[PDB]
Symmetry: C3
Subunit: 69 residues, 3 copies
């Protein structure tokens, strides 16, 4: 169970950020996630054996935002 | 039939504000509502016998914004 | 096949702009469109015989943004 601060560009709407939190949440592995709209940050916590950042990032880019690598 | 200027924080998108206007609109009581994205204001008008601010606020917070009390 | 820079006000969310690109895209005539969120611009390219700016604008205003005439 790790905790990471993904750097995210492009998030600007409090309503739409709700969907970020929701899709990264529906990922097995994901024990929690909280989107910090103003820091462009998606601090996440999870089971590193059950999901990867790659998916998580992938689930973040499918909303259309940019995950810094 | 009253007219109130709800103070709202978090609204930033012209497209998403459309949904605010729409859900507070579908509330029985609600004779009209207009969202002022730049003043963070949801001036509403309604039948005070047929719906409360509480719901209205509630319908605004379900979009994810913050109704000042 | 023309290429136009529609001036657009109101676009602010990278996620929601995705829907702009998508609906103007589903228009017969439309060979491409790219939304420039920061310039408030919707540079489009199309077959002038198969769709008009009017629709395109119309498809942009249905998202709730303002097409400068
Ligand atoms: Cu939004
Ligand atoms: Cu939006
Ligand atoms: Cu959005």
């Amino acid at each position: 169970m790790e905790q990471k601060t993904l750097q995210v560009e492009g998030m600007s709407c409090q309503h739409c950020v709700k969907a970020v939190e929701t899709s990264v949440g529906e990922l097995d592995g994901v024990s929690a996630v909280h989107v910090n709209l103003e820091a462009g940050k998606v601090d996440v916590s999870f089971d590193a054996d059950k999901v990867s950042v790659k998916d998580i990032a992938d689930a973040i880019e499918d909303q259309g935002y940019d995950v810094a690598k």
